[PDB]
Design a protein around this ligand. Structure first.
Ligand code: 52F
Length: 167
């Protein structure tokens, strides 16, 4: 048993809810929250900007030190950093950004990072401002992630559509 509440079960291991991932992280304090990161760990907008703002910019300070030491992530890659006040850990995962022209086939590689963690609170990768089709992102998630994932969908109207179209 875990502390996640009000989720619709989609599969054996994937759950979904209409929720603000920041508010959800603050309530649950999960072991792992996933960030919709870019390769520079520049947390400006979407889930990254919102998560970073909730940490009072401590996420960005830690991220800048990580990049200064290690250089940029790969598209499809990830790193584990602190969860600050939101979670034990933050898994920063880089899905492909369609609005920058990145290969959508890298979305499966991005979701494979989730399999290194038994339970995660996450957004849909490559969705929203990343420019990919969220229905596609949910399908790749269900077909790739084998660990237990609690998906927070921010947009109410998109959520109504993801549930009603899910196969
Ligand atoms: O809802 C999410 O969690 C996915 C990212 C996202 N997609 C949208 C699509 C259309 C309109 C608003 C949107 N807001 C969003 O946050």
């Amino acid at each position: 048993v875990n502390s996640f509440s009000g989720y619709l079960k989609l599969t054996d291991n994937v759950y979904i809810k209409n929720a603000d991932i920041v508010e959800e992280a603050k309530k649950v304090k999960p072991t792992v929250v996933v960030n919709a990161a870019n390769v520079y760990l520049k947390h400006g907008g979407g889930v990254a900007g919102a998560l970073n703002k909730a940490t009072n910019n401590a996420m960005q300070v830690e991220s800048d030190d990580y990049i200064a030491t290690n250089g940029p992530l790969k598209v499809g890659g990830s790193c584990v950093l602190s969860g600050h006040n939101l979670a034990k850990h933050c898994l920063h995962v880089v899905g492909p950004n369609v609005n920058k022209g990145e290969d959508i086939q890298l979305l499966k590689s991005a979701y494979e990072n989730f399999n290194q963690h038994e339970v995660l609170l996450a957004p849909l990768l490559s969705a929203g401002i990343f420019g990919a089709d969220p229905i596609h992102s949910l399908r790749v998630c269900v077909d790739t992630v084998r660990t237990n994932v609690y998906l927070a969908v921010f947009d109410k109207n998109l959520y109504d559509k993801l549930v009603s179209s899910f196969l």
